[PDB]
Amino acid sequence: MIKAVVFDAYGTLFDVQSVADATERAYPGRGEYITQVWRQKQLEYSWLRALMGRYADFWSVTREALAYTLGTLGLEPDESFLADMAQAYNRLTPYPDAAQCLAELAPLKRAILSNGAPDMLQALVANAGLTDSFDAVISVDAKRVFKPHPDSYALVEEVLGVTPAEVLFVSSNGFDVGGAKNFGFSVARVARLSQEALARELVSGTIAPLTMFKALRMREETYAEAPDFVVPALGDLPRLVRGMA
Amino acid sequence: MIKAVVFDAYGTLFDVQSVADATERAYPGRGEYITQVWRQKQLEYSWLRALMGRYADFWSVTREALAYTLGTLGLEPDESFLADMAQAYNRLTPYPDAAQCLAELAPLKRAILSNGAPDMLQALVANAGLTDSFDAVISVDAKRVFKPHPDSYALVEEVLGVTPAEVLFVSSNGFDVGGAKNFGFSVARVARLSQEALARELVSGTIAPLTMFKALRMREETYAEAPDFVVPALGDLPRLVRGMA
Ligand SMILES: [Cl-]
Ligand SMILES: [Cl-]
């Protein structure tokens, strides 16, 4: 039976697009671009560092990704600037229905499994006012790998004492849905972009950069096992779990 | 001393853009989009499968990435169509100065180390008429991992019997440059996109797709160790090696 609901953090509980005003105010006219590449390279670097066996925590990864992104524009800000701007990732706005969702899941164990470094996650959750909505906020850091490495998901049992079969893993990220399924969790994917809308957007004329990100990041990955469930929003989760087992 | 020059294949010896006319058929008006997302997802899938510990050779990866890409456009091609169109990757055009480069690099050992599956590389190299330019064409398939996993590079000493220090690794891919430096090779990066041109391109009003691919794929990655050498083209390597020794 499902004894725990484990949440992916970035893109799932928290909007990664919500760094837009900071990236934009900091560099006018370049906000949307930076927001997309920052996230894309943040992911790529987590995968590439882990696959090289050269781990560094998500805070270092987040700042490396930012430096690369600003670099593409011809900017070379010092470490102090990068650390300050990177704080934006610790202030992501939670999705409007995250709190209500977590409230309705109170009977079950509630947790986060994230690539985020310990201090990042704490700040992130505390600033969202969701600290009291979780029995555990788990960082992959202890394992010194990143998703979808199996060791990242092994932490769930270690911390909560529940078996993979008793876990419902929630994520808006294809790669993370694939990792959790591979490891043996039941998965609910959060799909906020309808496939039919993307298809039409991709042919609505000249393809914008924001649509590029969506095309790379907001779909199920073809190499990955399909999720057990797909909901359009977090608020649908409580009800999904009700009529589940 | 440099006893062998080991080349990255895709993007380095072979133009991944040269699938343009094949994709422009799979969907007139969208060949450029497909070309770019296909290559991007092809790379992501190689990283994610390996990191997940669920290897499938580059031929499956190539097809899965193509299916994903076409799927974003709303198409649902069958296996036969995918396998047929994916052949475009075994017909990539070598860069105009590749042959000359390889010739002038003899009698030094010359080899390919590529993510490509064995039959892909053989067909790709044979179509380009470069079979007699290489002492060995090495696929990572033997290790059942993908770059930048260290085992990928370990094959080089196994096949050529040269130590990492005796290898000059050539690649246009920042993640491959990073993995080879990580492993211990000396590395010559082929940088066909000037940083200053990209920076300005990203500032010139609306940002095109190819530009998005370029921003994501044609730079040195910030987490990676820098390459020992950077040249503009393959033809510059023979001279690099000479002035090097
Ligand atoms: Cl993430
Ligand atoms: Cl490759």
- DSSP codes, B54-110: ----HHHHHHHHHHHHHHHTT----HHHHHHHGGGGGSPEEPTTHHHHHHHHTTSEE
Structure tokens at A95: 């999705």
Burial of A165 (0-12, 13-18, 19+ CB in 10 A): exposed
For residue A131, the tally of other CB atoms under 10 A from its CB is: 12
Q: Looking at CA atoms only, how far is residue A216 from chain B in angstroms?
A: 7
Cβ-based neighbours of B120, under 8 Å, separated by 6 or more: B58, B59, B62, B89, B90, B139
Structure tokens at A88: 């934006």
The secondary structure element, H or E, covering residue A139 is strand A136-139
For residue B103, the tally of other CB atoms under 10 A from its CB is: 11
- Resolution to 1 decimal, in Å? 2.1
Residue A156 phi, psi dihedral angles, 5° rounding: -60, -50
b/e map A186-204, b = 16+ CB within 10 Å: bbbbbbebeeeebbebbee
Structure tokens at A47: 């995968």
Q: Among all ligands shown, which has an atom nearest to the Cα of B112?
A: 2
Domain B1-15+91-241: homologous superfamily in CATH: HAD superfamily/HAD-like (3.40.50.1000)
Amino acid identity for residue A4 in this structure: A
Of A49, A69, A75, A58, the closest CA to residue B224 belongs to A49
Q: Are B163 and B209 in contact (CB under 8 A)?
A: no
Structure tokens at A189: 């994917």
The reply to whether B206 touches chain A by the CB within 8 Å rule is yes
Structure tokens at A212: 């590029």
The secondary structure element, H or E, covering residue B41 is helix B31-52
In whole angstroms, give the CA distance from residue B103 to residue A53.
Answer: 36
The SS3 of residue A85 is helix
Number of A/B CB contacts below 8 angstroms equals: 138
In whole angstroms, give the CA distance from residue B142 to residue B120.
Answer: 14
Residues belonging to chain A: 245
In whole angstroms, give the CA distance from residue B5 to residue A192.
Answer: 48
The reply to whether B50 touches chain A by the CB within 8 Å rule is yes
In whole angstroms, give the CA distance from residue A184 to residue B54.
Answer: 13
Facing B64 at nearest CB: one of A50, A51, A223:
A223
Instruction: Give the architecture (CATH level 2) of A16-90.
Output: Orthogonal Bundle (1.10)
CA A69–ligand 2 middle distance (angstroms) = 22
* Eight-state DSSP code of residue B117: -
Structure tokens at A93: 């706005």
Residues belonging to chain B: 245
Mutate which: A58, A173, A223, A225, vs B, most B CBs within 10 A: A223
Name the closest residue on chain A to residue B180, using Cα atoms.
A52
**Which member of A8, A57, A141, A176 is catalytic?**
A8
Experimental method: X-ray
The strand pair at B93-94 and B14-15 is best described as antiparallel
Facing A47 at nearest CB: one of B47, B54, B212:
B47
The domain ranges of chain B are: 1-15+91-241, 16-90
CA B152–ligand 1 middle distance (angstroms) = 26
In whole angstroms, give the CA distance from residue A15 to residue A11.
Answer: 5
Rounded to whole angstroms, what are the CA distances from B232 to A78, B12, B16, B170, B194? 28, 11, 17, 12, 9
